[PDB]
Amino acid sequence: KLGIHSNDTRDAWVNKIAQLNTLEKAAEMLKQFRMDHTTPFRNSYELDNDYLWIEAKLEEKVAVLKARAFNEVDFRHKTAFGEDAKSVLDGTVAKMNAAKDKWEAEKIHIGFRQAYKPPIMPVNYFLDGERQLGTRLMELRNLNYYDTPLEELRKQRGVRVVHLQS
Amino acid sequence: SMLGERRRGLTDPEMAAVILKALPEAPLDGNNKMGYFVTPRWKRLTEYEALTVYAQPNADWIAGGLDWGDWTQKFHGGRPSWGNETTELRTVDWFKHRDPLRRWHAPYVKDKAEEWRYTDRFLQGYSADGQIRAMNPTWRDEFINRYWGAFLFNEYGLFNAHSQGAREALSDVTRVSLAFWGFDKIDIAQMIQLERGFLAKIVPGFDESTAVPKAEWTNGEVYKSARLAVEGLWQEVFDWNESAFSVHAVYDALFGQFVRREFFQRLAPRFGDNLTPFFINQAQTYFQIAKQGVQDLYYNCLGDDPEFSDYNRTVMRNWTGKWLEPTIAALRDFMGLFAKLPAGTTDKEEITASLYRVVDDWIEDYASRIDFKADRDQIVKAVLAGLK
Amino acid sequence: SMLGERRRGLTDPEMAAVILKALPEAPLDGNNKMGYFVTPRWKRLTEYEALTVYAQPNADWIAGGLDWGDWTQKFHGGRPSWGNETTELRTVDWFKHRDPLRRWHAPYVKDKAEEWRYTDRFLQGYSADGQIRAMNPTWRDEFINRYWGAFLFNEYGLFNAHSQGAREALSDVTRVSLAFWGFDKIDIAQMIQLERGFLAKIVPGFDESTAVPKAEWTNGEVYKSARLAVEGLWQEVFDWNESAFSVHAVYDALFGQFVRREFFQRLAPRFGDNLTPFFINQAQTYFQIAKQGVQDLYYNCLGDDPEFSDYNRTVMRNWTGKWLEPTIAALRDFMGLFAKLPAGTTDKEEITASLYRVVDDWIEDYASRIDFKADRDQIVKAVLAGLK
Amino acid sequence: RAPTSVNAQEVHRWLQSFNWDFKNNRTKYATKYKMANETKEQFKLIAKEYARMEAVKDERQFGSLQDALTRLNAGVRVHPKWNETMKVVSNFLEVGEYNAIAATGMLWDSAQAAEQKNGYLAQVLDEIRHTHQCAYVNYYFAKNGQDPAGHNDARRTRTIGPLWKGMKRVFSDGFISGDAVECSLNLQLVGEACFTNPLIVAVTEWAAANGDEITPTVFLSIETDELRHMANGYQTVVSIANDPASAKYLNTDLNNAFWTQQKYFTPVLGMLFEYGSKFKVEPWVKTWDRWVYEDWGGIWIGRLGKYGVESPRSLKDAKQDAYWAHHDLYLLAYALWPTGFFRLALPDQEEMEWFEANYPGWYDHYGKIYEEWRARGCEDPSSGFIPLMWFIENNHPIYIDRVSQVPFCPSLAKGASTLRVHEYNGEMHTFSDQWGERMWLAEPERYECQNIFEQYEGRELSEVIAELHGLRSDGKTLIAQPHVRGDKLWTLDDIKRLNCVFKNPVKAFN
Amino acid sequence: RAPTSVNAQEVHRWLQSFNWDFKNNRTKYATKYKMANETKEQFKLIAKEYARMEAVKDERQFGSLQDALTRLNAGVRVHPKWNETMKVVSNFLEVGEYNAIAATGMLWDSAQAAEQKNGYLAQVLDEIRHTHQCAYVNYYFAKNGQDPAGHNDARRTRTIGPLWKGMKRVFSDGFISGDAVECSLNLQLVGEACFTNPLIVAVTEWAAANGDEITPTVFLSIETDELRHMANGYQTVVSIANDPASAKYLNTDLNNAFWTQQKYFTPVLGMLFEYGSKFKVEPWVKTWDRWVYEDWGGIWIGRLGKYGVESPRSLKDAKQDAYWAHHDLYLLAYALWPTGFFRLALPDQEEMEWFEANYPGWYDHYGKIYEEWRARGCEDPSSGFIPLMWFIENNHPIYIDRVSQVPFCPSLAKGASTLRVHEYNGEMHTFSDQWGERMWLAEPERYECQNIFEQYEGRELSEVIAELHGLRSDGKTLIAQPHVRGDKLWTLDDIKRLNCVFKNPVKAFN
Ligand SMILES: OCCCCCCBr
Ligand SMILES: OCCCCCCBr
Ligand SMILES: OCCCCCCBr
Ligand SMILES: OCCCCCCBr
Ligand SMILES: OCCCCCCBr
Ligand SMILES: OCCCCCCBr
Ligand SMILES: OCCCCCCBr
Numbered sequence A: 001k002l003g004i005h006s007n008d009t010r011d012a013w014v015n016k017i018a019q020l021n022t023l024e025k026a027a028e029m030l031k032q033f034r035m036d037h038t039t040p041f042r043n044s045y046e047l048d049n050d051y052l053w054i055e056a057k058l059e060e061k062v063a064v065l066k067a068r069a070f071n072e073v074d075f076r077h078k079t080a081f082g083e084d085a086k087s088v089l090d091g092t093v094a095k096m097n098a099a100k101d102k103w104e105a106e107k108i109h110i111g112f113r114q115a116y117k118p119p120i121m122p123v124n125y126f127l128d129g130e131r132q133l134g135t136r137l138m139e140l141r142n143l144n145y146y147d148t149p150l151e152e153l154r155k156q157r158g159v160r161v162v163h164l165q166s
Numbered sequence B, C: 001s002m003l004g005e006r007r008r009g010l011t012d013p014e015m016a017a018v019i020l021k022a023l024p025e026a027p028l029d030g031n032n033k034m035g036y037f038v039t040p041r042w043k044r045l046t047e048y049e050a051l052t053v054y055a056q057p058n059a060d061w062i063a064g065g066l067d068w069g070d071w072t073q074k075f076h077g078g079r080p081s082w083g084n085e086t087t088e089l090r091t092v093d094w095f096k097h098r099d100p101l102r103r104w105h106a107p108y109v110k111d112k113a114e115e116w117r118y119t120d121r122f123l124q125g126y127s128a129d130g131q132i133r134a135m136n137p138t139w140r141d142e143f144i145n146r147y148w149g150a151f152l153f154n155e156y157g158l159f160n161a162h163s164q165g166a167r168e169a170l171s172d173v174t175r176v177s178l179a180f181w182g183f184d185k186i187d188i189a190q191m192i193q194l195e196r197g198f199l200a201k202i203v204p205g206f207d208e209s210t211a212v213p214k215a216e217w218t219n220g221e222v223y224k225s226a227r228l229a230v231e232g233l234w235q236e237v238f239d240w241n242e243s244a245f246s247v248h249a250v251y252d253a254l255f256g257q258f259v260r261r262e263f264f265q266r267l268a269p270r271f272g273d274n275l276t277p278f279f280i281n282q283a284q285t286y287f288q289i290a291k292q293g294v295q296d297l298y299y300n301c302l303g304d305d306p307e308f309s310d311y312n313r314t315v316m317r318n319w320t321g322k323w324l325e326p327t328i329a330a331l332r333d334f335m336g337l338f339a340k341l342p343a344g345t346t347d348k349e350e351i352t353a354s355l356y357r358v359v360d361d362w363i364e365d366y367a368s369r370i371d372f373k374a375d376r377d378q379i380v381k382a383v384l385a386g387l388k
Numbered sequence D, E: 001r002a003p004t005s006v007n008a009q010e011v012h013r014w015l016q017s018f019n020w021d022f023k024n025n026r027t028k029y030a031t032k033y034k035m036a037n038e039t040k041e042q043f044k045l046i047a048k049e050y051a052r053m054e055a056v057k058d059e060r061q062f063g064s065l066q067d068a069l070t071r072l073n074a075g076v077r078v079h080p081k082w083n084e085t086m087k088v089v090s091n092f093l094e095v096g097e098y099n100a101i102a103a104t105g106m107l108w109d110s111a112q113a114a115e116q117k118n119g120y121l122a123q124v125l126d127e128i129r130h131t132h133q134c135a136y137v138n139y140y141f142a143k144n145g146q147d148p149a150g151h152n153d154a155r156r157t158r159t160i161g162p163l164w165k166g167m168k169r170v171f172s173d174g175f176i177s178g179d180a181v182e183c184s185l186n187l188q189l190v191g192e193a194c195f196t197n198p199l200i201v202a203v204t205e206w207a208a209a210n211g212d213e214i215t216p217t218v219f220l221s222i223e224t225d226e227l228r229h230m231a232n233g234y235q236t237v238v239s240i241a242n243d244p245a246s247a248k249y250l251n252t253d254l255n256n257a258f259w260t261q262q263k264y265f266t267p268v269l270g271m272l273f274e275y276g277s278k279f280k281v282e283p284w285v286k287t288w289d290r291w292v293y294e295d296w297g298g299i300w301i302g303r304l305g306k307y308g309v310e311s312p313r314s315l316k317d318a319k320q321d322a323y324w325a326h327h328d329l330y331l332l333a334y335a336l337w338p339t340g341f342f343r344l345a346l347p348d349q350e351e352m353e354w355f356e357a358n359y360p361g362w363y364d365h366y367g368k369i370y371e372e373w374r375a376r377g378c379e380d381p382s383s384g385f386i387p388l389m390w391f392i393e394n395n396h397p398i399y400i401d402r403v404s405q406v407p408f409c410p411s412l413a414k415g416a417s418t419l420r421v422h423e424y425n426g427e428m429h430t431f432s433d434q435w436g437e438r439m440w441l442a443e444p445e446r447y448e449c450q451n452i453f454e455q456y457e458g459r460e461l462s463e464v465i466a467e468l469h470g471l472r473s474d475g476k477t478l479i480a481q482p483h484v485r486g487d488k489l490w491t492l493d494d495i496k497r498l499n500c501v502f503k504n505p506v507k508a509f510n
């Protein structure tokens, strides 16, 4: 079974998700999943074709478990890991405002998403973060956007140039 | 110019014969129903559904999406164009919602246009019929111009609360409903100003400037908590569903209904004012139209979701508790307005009874749908403390 | 078949080529304006005039006629299809009249259609909003069901008074105006029943039957003289201009305007009734609409006729007196209605203020036009002599 | 608190009770019948719903007209002949729609049952709608078409010619002058029930065949309202079926109405279709037999049998006179082309072949005449020849029936050739058939319409044309023309120079 | 006591005062810019009046479509090729209209001035109208056309092919993902201001040329709404012109937006017009140079110089790569015909002559290719041949740009032949130009879109088509076809028998 919308990998993960009966275990699995399979910094591209869908299924389980485990106040203001959402947001924004260059900034924003994306952090705090973190990231990145030659930009990004044609 | 230089394939003999010669004997498929693959909510698929469902290019990783793969271009940082991360609510399919009124753009602007033209006819008839002669002066210059006028900012704020949803809604059917709920709110704010502008034209000395109503809204006491609630609902909520649900299924259903129906619609007639009720009729019709859509989305689709019913109700109960407090504060501060009325206008018993109607309607139409255990007398007693 | 068997000249290659070949290089006359020979009432000829003026095939022997000769077929006895003999009024041209609203069939039904759809939306919102909860039972079950309902027969009778005018009108512009005046009247009557039917649906034991409201009209005391006046304007007048004039410039301008506005429209709000006023708003809008047309015809055209100005003003002044009396009787009997209102509902000081509003408005819009010197105080006094 | 409302039917349920008994509650118009006050109507409508149902139709119609059709230049890409035909079709239909307003107003006054009054009322409004629709057709072709003249002023230019007189008799006076029931028979039982298909629907067919998509757009919309009017006509018979007067007068008023309507319809509509077009849909004889004789005279009327209604006794007579009627009349219309407000065209080769094929013997009579006139230069202003001269030369008098106003030429006609001439109190009268003769003899004062010869007597042709504005905007070129080409148009002078003077043909018997 | 009322402008006069100050009254979206507090809007509208003006347009539009156009069978009498083109034109445009709703909601949120918010709001409502209009076109052609397949399910069948990925980049994600201002430049300053004429208006011209009067009726109505959106775009620049951030970032975002939009627009629109039609209106080369290069790139953009706006620095490259772009792409589109939801045709004789005439050298390159594929039996199901096979044999790999999603075959193209392959953190990336390359290098996390080869790798062609419902109602015949004739249509089995299996072309690199 190798289909686009239905296949063995997806089926396997659905089973793996059904075995998360506790919030802490499920939340940890979701965060680990994001480090392993999301963003260009993912540990591996093995799940490239199904990670988006699998991640969503895992999010569903964490959300349901969080809602049942948390009182009303904590559901609104605490991350799935028990951290004060506001403190995390402010602390991350503080680090972003102290970022010295666009390289440190991208690491900050991307890492924030992999670790706190809902249902880990409440949506209100998370998107307020997207608002602030995204602003600084772009301000640093779009300054003198074309000055660095592609030859040098390839080196900064750290890609391995495999082939060039022109 | 009689015939023209542009030759059209449908009427030009030479071109038309070429076209016809290339045509097949019959259609290359007998299934002439666009959207045939959409699961109909009613007996047969509707034009509303066909023209709307699946317009949004969601991939399958956003519940109900038919596409596949990541978005082509995301935000700096990685945020998806649309994503599950923009709201706490979960569902088996974001495309299940259906506006019970089946409003796509054409029917929507058609009805609003009819209302605009009839409104113009009404005003010309009202002014020519000199009906303004019987309207109590103090009610007109004090309560309509200042207090009803300040309420436009409440509706304007609720309109603006919809901006983020217009961008983040996870489906076409929800985006269209959401946009129309918002557009009707700005319409009402504009109708309140329209009435003030009309009075300025037929009442010597009547100033249509928004300075007075705006100062009342921004610095008065009657609307202080209402404004604090509106500012929060609009700018402190980053979850498009929390916004739409809290606005329509909590704040506007309690505070909005009380102000529009139990205060102004209820007392205007008593002062010879058939003008304000004309516009409030539109606002209430709009409220009832939106209510159907709001109930379908939050109760029929999400609150009763076959997989996330329990979860979604927990979240909505959370939101109701979160916004019920600020809503009660808004009603409590609004109670101060009754002490401004001429003696004998109304009494504590009428006020209370009217609060219970609003609270009871809310329990029936909203709270009970998610098992929120509202205490009607506790809610009312809390509001009444605001009476002077 | 996919193409069908019928070949159309606009798209069929062979047939279209033949048509194109036969066409002239350019239009055979540059005057592409239909009705270009009609004298515009305004800056430029309007669609309304072009499509209406001279549709009636009158010959020159009927003031303004462009045709010649007698009719082709007349009544047994010799009475002409249309003739000067069907009205006392005379003019230099029966086609002078112009509806200030310039209503030809399309605009007329468009507007009424909008009103019909909005009305339905209103009623659905009203019911859904539970606004009936604030309406006074007695007013609802007694004054609206019996007295408002009985008034439907008054509007129905006035509608029927137009039947002969629909047949005898001496021009197209007048015929179209007359038809719309009568059609709006039956609409109002039907809107009276609509409301009663709406009440029957949302009020448990409310009986929509016309049984009660009919006996009140046919046997009641409050509408006894009103009905007597209607029966006369309808079946006793054989002059289509006397009927239209007396109905709209005398009887309905006074009695009707009082019953509708100065009574139900003024008292309904006090009993928590925003429903009835919704329909009165239409009746009044319709009244004001017809008013602009009635004025233009009998005043601007006939009353100010370059050759029959004096003659017509005389005839109209004469009609005003003929019906000003039966109209006074109608109001007097209506006064007896107040004695049934909840003790304290209204005082003789209010009625006098309203009575003068009507009478005064009448003199400013109708009386002073044909110089019918009338005494406001004596009229109000004669009508006021019917109270408790 | 469930959303609730009320519909037309729910209100109409109580409409019948709206009317109340009282002294003079009776029709103001003379009539021999008594319409039952308990009569009902088929459609349960109230004013507001009526408006809505019609507004929707208007939407589609005007939308197609203002948008797509205009973008396709539909007002232009129509055969010249059909452009001319619509000047007559739309304006002549316009007056029928218009007088129908007054007619139904009179019927509304006649009906005593609130429901029957309401049914007639819907038609009152519908006919106003139709009046404006026909007006819009001329308005649109005038604004966007190949020849605005006639389309832009028919309301006054139609008064020049003799064909207009007959139109007023069937669609104006026949609809409103007489017993209300006789008027209903002329308008609804005969006119609407019998002609809706062979006239309105057929027109849309002939129009489409000739490139005209404007008329179909409008006429098809008009057609959707006709069912209500046919129902009104049907209920008119039902409402008087009980009254004893019915058995004594119905079939008579019905026969007179049928003959009246067919007298004009038969020759004129056939003429407009076959001679006012290039492309043909179906031979008029076939259309007439199927709709007038078969469908109406048989099926429709048959269903009214239980109410004492019988097929017009003159039905057979009508079918007999019909065959060559339209052909006979076009000869007269073309011969008198200067009196119209539209341009005429002689049959081309294909057409003549079509006529002969469908009407054996057509060429040997009409065909040869037209070729003779053409070779002589009837289409060319420099020829100095107008076909009316050919009638004088060959002693073929053209009379105007005193009752129907239809022009007829006994000495030339292939169809009916009967002629009855009488003198009464110093006035001569010419009749073309036995039915119309009886009408005049029995009801002399109902038929005193002056004919074109009586009014124009002694007048020079160009004088009549000039006075009645039969000119184009250049103030010199005639609106009417003997051909449909864009060059060599006739002017007032081309006519004046011939010195044709009108004479009252009946005085020849003096 | 005279009749009076209040209009839109009279209420609009006070709309700017509607917003008020509070600590958290600020946009919820990330942005490098500051929209001025007092920005105004050009059109003084309120909800009611906005609705009325659009309602009037709808009447006209739907009136034409439901009445006259349907009566004329306009849904059928269209060239087969154009019927196919509209499946793509209307559905792909539909997604642009749709995402523009979200885009303007995001802009409405960004604006702080009540008037600027209101201006964006009108567009939010207009884009919902356009979404439903584009849907209606597909809805109409499915209901009344010669081939409903694709027209009836594009919303799900568009997902099978690679061209759809590129559309989502410029008309979906490009409109809503990024700095709100960047999104505005993509949508309004570039998209709408630069493409309205060469896309919307041009489409109505090509449509009419190929017998389609349905699209002109709808698209011409859509066009009347655009002025407001161009104004929104213009005012966006004005609102941020006075902020120091503008001089630092505006031209960079504008340049990126321009390259993004043209990258897809240039090859795809030219392809739809020239290869998706029978009758040609104008060579794409000149249409492009006039509207994109001259009118927009010169006149329009020039008027914004006062605000610091400069001509996109990549405008030169766009022009250079433009000439052969659409020709190069159709080769790939046809080669991958089984992945579409529409039927494709090889250029006929008259077309090849037209192509060579307007694009010298066309025949020696593309012309001969098509002739060989024809000879190989690409149109015949029994041939067992798909152009895809020709690319394999001649070793001409097809890559997918990681940023724009536009497919490119550098070894065969007469146009751009650049190819850049990078490896980063275990993943390979392929770029077709220097602008998109910088975009990915600078913003890797914004561009992780899986391409068809990556998703379909190891899958047999017919299996992908079946899973994604690329079949007609008989459940066997493919929606997509290599010819537009009514006979010999390929079935799923005809494809399966070819045993074509997807492979990722980038894997060859070590
Ligand atoms: O070519 C024919 C001349 C046109 C006649 C002028 C009519 Br206004
Ligand atoms: O309806 C208007 C009166 C004439 C109708 C004739 C049937 Br085509
Ligand atoms: O029978 C009446 C004939 C009238 C036809 C008028 C042109 Br549609
Ligand atoms: O199109 C030719 C016009 C028809 C003329 C005969 C008169 Br009813
Ligand atoms: O029947 C004789 C034809 C009458 C001649 C016309 C003179 Br204007
Ligand atoms: O009608 C031909 C279809 C156009 C094909 C290319 C897909 Br963008
Ligand atoms: O207006 C909707 C957004 C896309 C517009 C493209 C300009 Br043709």
Ligand SMILES: OCCCCCCBr
Binding pocket: E088, E089, E090, E092, E093, E167, E170, E195, E199, E203, E261, E264, E265, E266, E268, E269, E272
């Ligand atoms: O640049 C816009 C590309 C449009 C592709 C098909 C739409 Br009309």
Ligand SMILES: [Ca+2]
Binding pocket: B221, B224, B333
């Ligand atoms: Ca306070």
Ligand SMILES: [Fe+3]
Binding pocket: D097, D100, D126, D127, D130, D222
């Ligand atoms: Fe009619």
Ligand SMILES: [Fe+3]
Binding pocket: D100, D127, D192, D226, D229
């Ligand atoms: Fe009719």
Ligand SMILES: [Fe+3]
Binding pocket: E097, E100, E126, E127, E130
């Ligand atoms: Fe758009």
Ligand SMILES: [Fe+3]
Binding pocket: E100, E127, E192, E226, E229
């Ligand atoms: Fe746009």
